[PDB]
Amino acid sequence: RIAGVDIPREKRVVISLTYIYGIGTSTAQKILEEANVSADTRVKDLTDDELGRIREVVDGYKVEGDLRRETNLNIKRLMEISSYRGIRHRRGLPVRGQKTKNNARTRKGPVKT
C-alpha cells in the first residue's frame, strides 16, 4: 500500500505508482525525483525509508478520493445547471461536440436497435 491502495510487487516503482487513480507516468517520475529513489527498483525490494519518502511526497497530491470527488461534483454541478454538457451527461452522449450520427459508442453503449 501507498496511498491507501495496493500496488503490484513485480512492477517497478514508476509503473506501479500509475495504478493509483490520480497518478500517471509524469507524476510518478516527478514524485520519484522528489523522494529520490531509483526507478529501476521494485517495491518487493524497497525499504521503509524509500517507501516513506514516497508516501510523504504523495500526500501532497490529490489522489484516490478527492479526485473522484472533484470529477463527480463538477459533473453534477453542470447537470444541476441546465447546461449543454450537463444535458449530454444526463443523456449519455458525447460532450466535446462530436457527431452522434455515427461512431459515438463509448458514450452510447453497444448497438441497440
Binding site: 444541476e80 445547471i81 441546465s82 447546461s83 449543454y84 454538457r85
Partner: protein, 79 residues
Amino acid sequence: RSIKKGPFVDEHLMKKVEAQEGSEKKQVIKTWSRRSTIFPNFIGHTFAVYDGRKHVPVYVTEDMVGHKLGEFAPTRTFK
C-alpha cells in the same frame, strides 16, 4: 477568450447590465448574444436568450459564471 486577453462580453449587454445595476431587477433583458461570457455581476438577473426562434428565459446563478449564455438555450429540440 480561452486566452490571456481576458473573457468576452458584448458591450451593449454590459451597458444594459450596468443600467440594471440599481438591483431592482424588475425586467428581463432581451438578447441575441449567446457568444458573451457570464460575469458575477449577472447573478439574480433574468436573461432572455435567442435560441433561433424563441427568446427563452434563463435564471443566472453563481454556478454559471465561467460559462456562456448559449449553454442554456438549446438550439436543437430532439425527442
